Symmetry: D2
Subunit: 74 residues, 4 copies
């Protein structure tokens, strides 16, 4: 369950991968990214997008299981 | 399927809310965040990412 | 009497020319540099500052 | 005769004094201001504006001395 460093690294990498050059620079400094303890070479591309995707899907599935209810509800 | 604009708005709000003043300012421009917010509550990037890890841990428990 | 806009344009051009990419970008917005350039040649902040020190050294030689 | 560090410090202080918060931040990092060797407490307010002023005046005076020429020119 997710730390500030982890979300900061995910965001930093999103800005980099999307060519948000000015934001990447400012954010790397403001979030103190160099002092974080994450091995970037082990972080796959589109990691933020992908986890966030799966978050949306996860909520959709949490909803759809209770979507119909049962014919015995009362 | 999450769009670019949607991700961008989610991180913009995260930057604002986390007090990353200079990043929010710069990202707001670079994003062209047209400079419904109302439907994006606080901590929304974080909340969705948290659901995503829950989902990843479900694939890892296959 | 140098105006704000004039100083701002002089530093904006200095930031651009010196390769301070992120500062120029951010300053261009913060300055509202309306986003005649043609009349402001390269190294113009520097050249005027250099004349100013020449003038300061003339007051120091009073 | 003026170094990059000096003009960078002058500019940094201009952005600060004018409340250009976002630019000051970015520029302090990009110009590596912390590694410069200038004692800020000895730098007066509006220093950039003032030296730049005096530069304009200095050029005006360089011009005005040759403005009329003489009645013996030929």
């Amino acid at each position: 369950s997710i730390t500030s460093d982890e979300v900061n690294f995910l965001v930093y990498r999103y800005l980099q991968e999307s060519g948000f050059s000015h934001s990447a620079f400012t954010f790397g400094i403001e979030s103190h990214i160099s002092q974080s303890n994450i091995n970037g070479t082990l972080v796959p591309p589109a990691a933020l997008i992908s986890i966030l995707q799966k978050g949306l899907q996860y909520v959709e599935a949490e909803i759809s299981i209770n979507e119909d209810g049962t014919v015995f509800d009362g």
